[PDB]
Amino acid sequence: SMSVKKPKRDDSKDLALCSMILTEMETHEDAWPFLLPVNLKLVPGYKKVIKKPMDFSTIREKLSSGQYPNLETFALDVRLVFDNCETFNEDDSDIGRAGHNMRKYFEKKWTDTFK
Template sequence: MTTRQKESSAPCHARFSGEGASSAFSPSKRRRMVTRNQPDLTFCEIILMEMEAHADAWPFLEPVNPRLVLGYRRIVKHPMDFLTMRERLLQGGYCSCEEFAADAHLVFDNCQLFNEDTSEVGLAGHAMRRFFESRWAEFYQDKDQ
């Protein structure tokens, strides 16, 4: 059995290491590998690109640095951000769109847990949640037709 076969037999969430996105495959090749087996994940990639380009995405583009944000690790037990989501998506770490959506919700839930609603980051989190929910609803509306 080759390494690649071993990886594909593992549960999707177990295949994602969370440690950087470097791989023997180029990003485009990794992307094709993911979307070939999970066509719905193409939408996840599209919505993630849209979220990353959104004006209010700045607090969520990379993991929070706990050295710069005191108390973050004490309050937020399961950190999540768009870069980690992108790495997981490219590495085939999502088995379904629902797993992807759960991570997106985790980003916004963590933001709401740690930040005041009226703070700059809190407002950005609410705007990004609305954007994600809107695009997600459009996807499922189109899927049902």
């Protein structure tokens, strides 16, 4: 509350650490479905169904241009990529499996880096 704060955590490396996580996600062999925005002209249904499209290149652009106010907002976008994936793709499909793989891969890097 006013003049009553938990000890100040060092957040000075967060931008650099998120960047590294995101690079590792970009270079994973199963990243291919998430590297670029889904083409809303070429994929029927996607624009109407998926209210907040997200992908790694968009995350990268936001990260590099100071559009994430904090760690949590970066993690929410990353998770959105996989939530979107699950909404649109069957679990038993190459893309559905990629999504589950990448979320697991992500959450581990996340826990190891920040928890």
